[PDB]
Ligand binder design. Structure first.
Ligand code: A1BF0
Length: 185
C-alpha cells in the first residue's frame, strides 16, 4: 500500500478508558493494570471491556496510523462512531458502530456480523489502519509482512464522527499483559 503519507499522530483519551487501564504519560501506550487504577467513574468509560478511544475525531479525508501488538494473545483494533454504547455488553459490528479486526484464541477475525475468518500467514507484530471517510472504507495492513492487506470494510455507513478504537483484551491466561503501542511516523 501507499497510504503512509496520510499518517496522523493518534493519542489516547484517558477519560474514555476502562478504569483498569494504564495509559502512558505520552498517551501513546495502553495496558491492563492488575486492579482498578484509582480514577472516578464517568459516562464515557467502557465498563465491561478493556477498551479506550483515541482523542482525535475524523469526519472527512484520509487517515493512517500503526499499532504494535507484539506478544499479545488477544486484542481488538479499528475505528468506531463517537456515539457507540459504553456500558454493558455489546458485539463489535458495523450495525453497532464499529469497524474492527481482532485476535482471539489463535485466530484473526473481522468484526462483521457474523464475524469473518481472516487468512494471515505471518502473525503481525504491527497493524496499519487506513480510513477513507468519503469513500466509506476501513482497511487493515500487516506491517510485519511488507504491508500486505488483511481486510477491507467497504460500503461503510459511518453515520457520525469516527474515533480510533482499541481493546487490550483480558489477561485471564497471564500471557496477555503486554501493551498496545501507537508506533512513530
Ligand atoms: C476489564 C476489567 C475488568 O472488568 N476485570 C474484571 C474481570 C477480570 C479482571 N482482570 S484480568 C483476568 O486480568 O483480565 C478485569
Amino acid at each position: 500500500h501507499h497510504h503512509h503519507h496520510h499518517m496522523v499522530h493518534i493519542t489516547l483519551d484517558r477519560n474514555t478508558a476502562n478504569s483498569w487501564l494504564i495509559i502512558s504519560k505520552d498517551r501513546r501506550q495502553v495496558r491492563m493494570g492488575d486492579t482498578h487504577q484509582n480514577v472516578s467513574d464517568n459516562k464515557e468509560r467502557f465498563s465491561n471491556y478493556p477498551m479506550v478511544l483515541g482523542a482525535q475525531r475524523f469526519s472527512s479525508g484520509k487517515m493512517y496510523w500503526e499499532v504494535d501488538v507484539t506478544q499479545k494473545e488477544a486484542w481488538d483494533l479499528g475505528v468506531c462512531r463517537d456515539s457507540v454504547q459504553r456500558k454493558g455488553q455489546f458485539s463489535l459490528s458495523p450495525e453497532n458502530g464499529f469497524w474492527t479486526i481482532w485476535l482471539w484464541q489463535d485466530s484473526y477475525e473481522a468484526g462483521t456480523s457474523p464475524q469473518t475468518t481472516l487468512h494471515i500467514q505471518v502473525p503481525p507484530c504491527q497493524i496499519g489502519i487506513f480510513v477513507d471517510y468519503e469513500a466509506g472504507v476501513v482497511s487493515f495492513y500487516n506491517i510485519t509482512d511488507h504491508g500486505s492487506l488483511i481486510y477491507t470494510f467497504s460500503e461503510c455507513v459511518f453515520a457520525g464522527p469516527l474515533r480510533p478504537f482499541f481493546n487490550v483484551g483480558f489477561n485471564y491466561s497471564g500471557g496477555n499483559a503486554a501493551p498496545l503501542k501507537l508506533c512513530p511516523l
